[PDB]
Write a protein that binds this ligand. Sequence first.
Ligand SMILES: O=c1[nH]c(=O)c2[nH+]cn([C@@H]3O[C@H](COP(=O)(O)O)[C@@H](O)[C@H]3O)c2[nH]1
Ligand SMILES: O=c1[nH]c(=O)c2[nH+]cn([C@@H]3O[C@H](COP(=O)(O)O)[C@@H](O)[C@H]3O)c2[nH]1
Ligand SMILES: [Mg+2]
Ligand SMILES: [Mg+2]
Ligand SMILES: [Mg+2]
Ligand SMILES: [Mg+2]
Lengths: 172, 171
Amino acid sequence: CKYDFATSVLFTEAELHTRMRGVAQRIADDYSNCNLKPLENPLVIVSVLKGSFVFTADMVRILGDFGVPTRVEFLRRGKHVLVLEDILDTALTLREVVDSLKKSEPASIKTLVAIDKPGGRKIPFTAEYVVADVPNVFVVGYGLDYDQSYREVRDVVILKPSVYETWGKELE
Amino acid sequence: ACKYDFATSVLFTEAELHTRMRGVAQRIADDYSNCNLKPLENPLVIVSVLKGSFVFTADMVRILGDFGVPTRVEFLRIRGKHVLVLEDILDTALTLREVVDSLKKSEPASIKTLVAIDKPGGRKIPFTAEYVVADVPNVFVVGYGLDYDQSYREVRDVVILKPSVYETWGK
Ligand SMILES: O=c1[nH]c(=O)c2[nH+]cn([C@@H]3O[C@H](COP(=O)(O)O)[C@@H](O)[C@H]3O)c2[nH]1
Ligand SMILES: O=c1[nH]c(=O)c2[nH+]cn([C@@H]3O[C@H](COP(=O)(O)O)[C@@H](O)[C@H]3O)c2[nH]1
Ligand SMILES: [Mg+2]
Ligand SMILES: [Mg+2]
Ligand SMILES: [Mg+2]
Ligand SMILES: [Mg+2]
């Protein structure tokens, strides 16, 4: 492949940004009757997990270029809150987090994930905004990690078992 | 001269910063090639500080990744490890000192500092960053992680903040 520990590059960096610009136009349309201004009424970004900091940094600057001003917060009333996550697999985290952003009842609350793994659900969750779908394969890159590594990968790729095995007999 | 409204001037852009970051990534590559940096085994621990360094952290770990500097991030808003702290702006250098001191009490292999914006004239205590992306005078800024009350972090460029914005807002 293009990398030396992958078998396939699912989504490149040019694809996600292109998709995130598309979703940004969707969020700019859906949030045009909210009167989104800096300070007074800026959209809130809830950045769950530890691997959502790459997607969050890219998204807040794509929404800003689409006139959708934001204010971020990290979790690792009268406000339209937006929860962001690197990947949506089992969907148990968001559900709790989403249901937990309601106890401080916001103006409105939707979810935005960069990578949706709809095939690995345990409870029926659906995000209003998804940048891309991926089959039930393990994909590192764009902040995603295998034991805290390979987050720095600009692309969403698939780690070769060898990499997962070669690291096996170093642990003990 | 400003490409915005909430600002009087544009000190540095997303393009000015990115080019400066590749040059600092190479030096990070030069000075860390003797440590034998490898994923999982011994990656370069990037300790991101504040809520604002998260932008500068997201772009810098993808430039250090281009030059072959694998990393594992930690956010503080390490034993026998090479730790590299990152912070958006360096002012009084107080916040940096304590974080590094606290980090020093875990005995990391090494430990240096990397900032995107340094305000050398804002020093309460003396402090030198091992790596620096840009220098600004003693003016209040926003953008690229630098915020005005949780706002303006989304600005792609580091800009000086207009006075009207926080005389009107600070009452
Ligand atoms: O790099 C990765 N590529 C993947 O495909 C993947 N799938 C799940 N994870 C791990 O899942 C945890 C949170 O995901 P969920 O809450 O959606 O289960 C996080 O702790 C992740 O480490 C992955 N990490
Ligand atoms: O948005 C901002 N624009 C600025 O120009 C600025 N100067 C100082 N600060 C704040 O002061 C802190 C300095 O921390 P140090 O002790 O490490 O210098 C930083 O971490 C910030 O909290 C700023 N925030
Ligand atoms: Mg996650
Ligand atoms: Mg993980
Ligand atoms: Mg050097
Ligand atoms: Mg390479």
